[PDB]
Design an enzyme around this catalytic site. Structure first.
Site, PDB file in Angstrom:
ATOM      1  N   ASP A  57       0.847  -1.193   0.000  1.00 42.01           N
ATOM      2  CA  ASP A  57       0.000   0.000   0.000  1.00 42.01           C
ATOM      3  C   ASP A  57       0.907   1.277   0.000  1.00 42.01           C
ATOM      4  OD1 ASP A  57      -2.238   1.606   0.349  1.00 42.01           O
ATOM      5  OD2 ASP A  57      -2.466   1.123   2.491  1.00 42.01           O
ATOM      6  N   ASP A  91      -0.121   4.830   1.468  1.00 38.72           N
ATOM      7  CA  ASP A  91      -0.343   5.417   2.785  1.00 38.72           C
ATOM      8  C   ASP A  91      -0.128   4.406   3.944  1.00 38.72           C
ATOM      9  OD1 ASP A  91      -1.194   8.242   3.673  1.00 38.72           O
ATOM     10  OD2 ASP A  91      -2.612   6.981   4.781  1.00 38.72           O
ATOM     11  N   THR A 101      -3.153   1.161  -4.209  1.00 42.60           N
ATOM     12  CA  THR A 101      -3.539   2.177  -3.269  1.00 42.60           C
ATOM     13  C   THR A 101      -4.900   2.811  -3.585  1.00 42.60           C
ATOM     14  OG1 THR A 101      -2.871   4.361  -2.441  1.00 42.60           O
ATOM     15  CG2 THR A 101      -2.353   3.830  -4.669  1.00 42.60           C
ATOM     16  N   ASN A 102      -5.602   3.174  -2.520  1.00 47.72           N
ATOM     17  CA  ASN A 102      -6.761   4.029  -2.620  1.00 47.72           C
ATOM     18  C   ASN A 102      -6.239   5.444  -2.629  1.00 47.72           C
ATOM     19  OD1 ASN A 102      -8.505   1.813  -2.505  1.00 47.72           O
ATOM     20  ND2 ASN A 102      -9.236   2.211  -0.467  1.00 47.72           N
ATOM     21  N   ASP A 114      -1.764  -1.240   6.100  1.00 51.10           N
ATOM     22  CA  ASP A 114      -1.861  -0.873   7.519  1.00 51.10           C
ATOM     23  C   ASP A 114      -3.315  -1.012   8.016  1.00 51.10           C
ATOM     24  OD1 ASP A 114      -2.810   1.359   6.071  1.00 51.10           O
ATOM     25  OD2 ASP A 114      -1.943   2.822   7.371  1.00 51.10           O
ATOM     26  N   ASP A 136      38.161  13.183 -15.201  1.00 47.00           N
ATOM     27  CA  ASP A 136      39.297  12.755 -16.060  1.00 47.00           C
ATOM     28  C   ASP A 136      39.350  13.738 -17.248  1.00 47.00           C
ATOM     29  OD1 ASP A 136      40.200  10.738 -18.634  1.00 47.00           O
ATOM     30  OD2 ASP A 136      41.442  10.480 -16.811  1.00 47.00           O
ATOM     31  N   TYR A 165      51.774   6.359 -19.767  1.00 50.20           N
ATOM     32  CA  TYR A 165      50.719   5.826 -20.667  1.00 50.20           C
ATOM     33  C   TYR A 165      50.192   6.872 -21.713  1.00 50.20           C
ATOM     34  CZ  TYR A 165      47.137   8.215 -18.204  1.00 50.20           C
ATOM     35  OH  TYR A 165      46.338   9.204 -17.640  1.00 50.20           O
ATOM     36  N   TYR A 197      44.064  12.867 -26.370  1.00 54.43           N
ATOM     37  CA  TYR A 197      45.451  12.971 -25.901  1.00 54.43           C
ATOM     38  C   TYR A 197      46.463  13.430 -26.881  1.00 54.43           C
ATOM     39  CZ  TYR A 197      44.240   9.917 -22.036  1.00 54.43           C
ATOM     40  OH  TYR A 197      43.561   9.316 -21.015  1.00 54.43           O
ATOM     41  N   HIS A 232      40.565   5.488  -9.534  1.00 53.72           N
ATOM     42  CA  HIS A 232      40.417   6.441 -10.627  1.00 53.72           C
ATOM     43  C   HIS A 232      38.955   6.557 -11.173  1.00 53.72           C
ATOM     44  CE1 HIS A 232      41.164   8.700 -14.323  1.00 53.72           C
ATOM     45  NE2 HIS A 232      40.494   7.757 -14.975  1.00 53.72           N
TER      46      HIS A 232
HETATM   47  N1  LIG Z   1      44.626   6.105 -12.042  1.00 54.89           N
HETATM   48  C1  LIG Z   1      44.433   5.747 -13.323  1.00 54.89           C
HETATM   49  N2  LIG Z   1      44.304   4.520 -13.800  1.00 54.89           N
HETATM   50  C2  LIG Z   1      44.115   4.464 -15.153  1.00 54.89           C
HETATM   51  C3  LIG Z   1      43.958   3.287 -15.878  1.00 54.89           C
HETATM   52  C4  LIG Z   1      43.802   3.425 -17.233  1.00 54.89           C
HETATM   53  C5  LIG Z   1      43.781   4.661 -17.829  1.00 54.89           C
HETATM   54  C6  LIG Z   1      43.570   4.705 -19.296  1.00 54.89           C
HETATM   55  F1  LIG Z   1      44.325   3.838 -19.980  1.00 54.89           F
HETATM   56  F2  LIG Z   1      42.282   4.399 -19.606  1.00 54.89           F
HETATM   57  F3  LIG Z   1      43.746   5.950 -19.813  1.00 54.89           F
HETATM   58  C7  LIG Z   1      43.934   5.849 -17.131  1.00 54.89           C
HETATM   59  C8  LIG Z   1      44.106   5.713 -15.767  1.00 54.89           C
HETATM   60  S1  LIG Z   1      44.335   6.935 -14.555  1.00 54.89           S
HETATM   61 MG   LIG Z   2      -3.288   2.610   4.081  1.00 52.39          MG
END
Ligand SMILES: Nc1nc2ccc(C(F)(F)F)cc2s1
Ligand SMILES: [Mg+2]
Ligand SMILES: Nc1nc2ccc(C(F)(F)F)cc2s1
Ligand SMILES: [Mg+2]
EC number: 3.3.2.10
Lengths: 546, 546
Positions: free
Chosen positions: B8, B10, B122-123, B184, B334, B382, B465, B523
């Site tokens: 229900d 209420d 419910t009503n 209830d 990010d 990376y 990037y 991350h």
């Molecule tokens: N603390 C972090 N771990 C990672 C893991 C991978 C990547 C990627 F390859 F995706 F860019 C960036 C980061 S930043």
């Molecule tokens: Mg009720």
């Protein structure tokens, strides 16, 4: 020879200029004449203001520099600044007082309409004040009407430096003698004039436009009243929500503020709201202009019952749920008008306010079958024509261009007769193969509808008329209720089917109903009288849904 | 044996009940005990209240009937009602005081999570009061968690009439002995009990849940804290805006109120905000969760320069223009974090407030090439790996499932080393063919990413990037500015690349910066600690963007 027109913002596209606010401020405060203009211009090319205009610093960083300049100017002029003297305060007031100079905009629009490339070239700043939204709004409203917006602070250059003019020419892809440039500051015109551009020194607007007219040879002054802004489909945000496994609803979305859901009639499109969508967004609303089920990019299942009012309304409720909107204002025309009254009656908690164009609210008569009621009124004969599945579809799909060009006609343009359509064998039996183009629409606009209806044709749309009985039984459940949320009924003098008198008893069911009425307006209200529709809706929105 | 659970509203899913408001009102006002309950129930099956509950009349029509009932009850009890006695007033207060009973909801959620079909029976009434939005909001928040919502006033039947229970069973597609029904009001349980449903009489919540647990054999009490609500892609509104001829941006959209634009990082998706989207909408915001350019359903042009920060930001500005939004709050993680700081610096007029998860604001160093700066910090190796077009694409596209299952790992789950990636020959050279599934994600969630990245792969994403130099030159133009709009920086203790200390000098550039910090958070912040992210964002939104 002239192909481009360039306008400044301050003192040209927007008034009063902030420079003149410096004049009046001096006077208001009985400061030495020109003291504020001196402080503003202090240091020239290397002063605080140029750095601002070039994007080196933001408005908030500049304010204290201008303050200091005002102190230095006052000391040397051997005066004192007032207690409370406040540059922030002065500029907030000035910047909010500044509004679009409508006649200049409409001239820029007209020149663009005759094929000019148009631009705004302005010395402006990066605005980070608490109240910056005011200006972001102004600039949005203006910039959408132009090919280019060139801002000193985004490009790193300022009028009157010669490089900005070269950057201007290169943006325009035009040589100097094809450009007219308008500015209120003569020093800023000089470098345009040096490259041989036509320049106009803008003091009062009318004289500037008179010059602008003479030099372009286009009428800009005393022109008739323009239509409201329309929408270009491919510039809109397009939205899609799945309300159940086989049904997705499409809509176009513009603006922020309270949600306003527009629901078109038969056989139409979100695009039938094209003149309302920018105006309502501009007025401070979030517009959601649907393709109703059966149409355009929304799904169009074949089965008749998929289009009864009950199913259609539950789906509009799901559409709000999935978008996360607890309510919307619902505004409908023709079939969409009927639907929004039903939303008001069955889901008042979801409807902030309800308005209909043309379609009256008439409660179901529990003592008479709806078919019978439809046969009572010769002008609804076209609805009976629509009953037999396939018959209306074949006629309407046969030649789409002829279909919409026949339908979409102003009252004075030989509207189809709604009269004895079954007897005659069809809606178009007595209309030309190639109708002329109505004043209401362009050939391109007709072709948007044609392309929309190529996806699903007329089966879904016609099905909205094929649930008389089923809708009647549902409506009968609501016969004890009244509509007590805010409501607006808009009648159209020359709609000869949904006649204004048909709405005359609505106050029995909607005791606080408000009204507008549009004279000389046929059935296709939004494109017949878009200006008057816009004014009536915005006024009712601001008072009743706000 | 039990397959369905029915609650229900209420007194069961929402508290305090409006019936108990009738008790306290009597007491508050020193009226005869039960007088208000008598007036409410007057006439029984044919009284005003049943007509309300059945959808015959609306709430506003009922109010004066209940008033009259209160008059009649008082006359016969030979007392007078207070001066100012106000049924409208009493019910407005009561209905706004009523809130979701969180532990009951979370039990209903858990049972649904183990495969129960769940419903609200419910009503309730058609609410047309000026303040009806309050309840429409409550019902939206509740109903999204259930298979069915059955409202007396939409179906024309009321508890305890036996037909509503049959309508319930038929909706559930379940036989009576597979259903537990909680209420209830004991008279409302009786007919469920007659068909042989398990019933629970709900007084205090904990005892009811104890019974509910015993009878379903599922743990409902003392359970660990659940995750926030997530999003099902195919239940969302999907939006599309063309920001220029080859580029359309997709986004998902939920909620109303100030616009909040979420900008994911690499290599992610709108869906990385799945735990924030419902919570921020619920908190009173209009969420726009992007696919950033390069990703998902947004366009992904091949050219590197299409992904420099300048172009990406101008396009986010166009995205606001076309949607008609003069501003939005921008929140980024990010790469999206880097982007929103740039939006703050170059378009402060368009940004209502800015927040970043993990990504600090660091001004470009005009005295050092950005490549050099990247080589200075072994943990960015990376990013160098990502430079050479095609190399990272081949590794990352080779096996998408292994890719996301490798990337998306909590801090304790053998994160990839970010260390000497070029030297080693790739990001995954030292990871398994079939990584185990992180606690952060389900197999289905990994497969959503996999299907997203099947459309465009990693070229667009990696290109974010590949504009080090071009971004550095653009950033250098902003070195005189400060960020003076409302700003929030959220650091994550165990992000070993975007380390919290890297944000330590931000106050030099953002003097009123606010902060949150999340401990034990790696991350992938939004799915690592969605609960804490939600609390930190909503608190900062309500204070700084509201
Ligand atoms: N603390 C972090 N771990 C990672 C893991 C991978 C990547 C990627 F390859 F995706 F860019 C960036 C980061 S930043
Ligand atoms: Mg009720
Ligand atoms: N006044 C009115 N004119 C027309 C013309 C056509 C239709 C259509 F066939 F589309 F339904 C309805 C109306 S209502
Ligand atoms: Mg000027």
């Amino acid at each position: 020879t002239l192909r481009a027109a360039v306008f400044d913002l301050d003192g040209v596209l927007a008034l009063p200029a902030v420079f003149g606010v410096l004049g009046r401020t001096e006077e208001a405060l009985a400061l030495p004449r020109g003291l504020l203009n001196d402080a503003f211009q202090k240091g020239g090319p290397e002063g605080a203001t140029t750095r601002l205009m070039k994007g080196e610093i933001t408005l908030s960083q500049w304010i204290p520099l201008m303050e200091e300049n005002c102190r230095k100017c006052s000391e040397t002029a051997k005066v004192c600044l007032p207690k409370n003297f406040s540059i922030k305060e002065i500029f907030d007031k000035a910047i909010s007082a500044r509004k679009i100079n409508r006649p200049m905009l409409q001239a820029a629009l007209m020149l663009r309409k005759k094929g000019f490339t148009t631009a705004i070239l302005t010395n402006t700043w990066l605005d980070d004040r608490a109240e910056r939204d005011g200006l972001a709004q102004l600039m949005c409203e203006l910039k959408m009407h132009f090919d280019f917006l060139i801002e000193s602070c985004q490009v790193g250059m300022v009028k009157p430096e010669p490089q900005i003019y070269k950057f201007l020419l290169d943006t325009l892809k035009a040589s100097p003698s094809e450009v007219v440039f308008l500015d209120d500051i003569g020093a800023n015109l000089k470098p345009a004039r040096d490259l041989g551009m036509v320049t106009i020194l803008v003091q009062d607007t009318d004289t500037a436009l008179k010059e602008l007219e003479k030099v372009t040879g286009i009428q800009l002054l005393n022109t008739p009243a323009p239509l409201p802004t329309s929408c270009n489909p491919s510039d809109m945000s397009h939205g899609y929500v799945t309300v159940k496994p086989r049904v997705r609803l499409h809509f176009v979305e513009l603006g922020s503020g309270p949600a306003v859901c527009l629901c078109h009639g038969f056989p139409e499109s979100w695009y039938s709201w094209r003149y309302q969508i920018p105006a309502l967004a501009q007025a401070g609303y979030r517009v959601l202009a649907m393709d109703m089920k059966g149409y355009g990019e929304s799904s169009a299942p074949p089965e008749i019952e998929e289009y009864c009012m009950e199913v259609l309304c539950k789906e509009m409720v799901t559409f709000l749920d999935k978008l996360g909107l607890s309510q919307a204002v619902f505004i409908g025309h023709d079939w969409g008008g009927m639907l929004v009254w039903y939303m008001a009656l069955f889901y008042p908690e979801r409807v902030r306010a309800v308005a209909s164009l043309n379609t009256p609210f008439i409660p179901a008569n529990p003592n008479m079958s709806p078919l019978e009621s439809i046969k009572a009124n010769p002008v609804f004969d076209y609805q009976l024509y629509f009953q037999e599945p396939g018959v209306a579809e074949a006629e309407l799909e046969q030649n789409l261009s002829r279909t919409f060009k026949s339908l979409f006609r102003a009252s004075d343009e030989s509207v189809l007769s709604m009269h004895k359509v079954c007897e005659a064998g069809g809606l178009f039996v007595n209309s030309p193969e190639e109708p002329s183009l109505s004043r209401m629409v362009t050939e391109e606009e007709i072709q948007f509808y044609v392309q929309q209806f190529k996806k699903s044709g007329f089966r879904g749309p016609l099905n909205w008329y094929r649930n008389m009985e089923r809708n009647w039984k549902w409506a009968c459940k609501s016969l004890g209720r009244k509509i007590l949320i805010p409501a607006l009924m808009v009648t159209a003098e020359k709609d000869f089917v949904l006649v204004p008198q048909m709405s005359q008893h609505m106050e029995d069911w909607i005791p606080h109903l408000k009204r507008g009425h549009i004279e000389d307006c046929g059935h296709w209200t939004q494109m017949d009288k878009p200006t008057e529709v816009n004014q009536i809706l915005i006024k009712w929105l601001d008072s009743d849904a706000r």
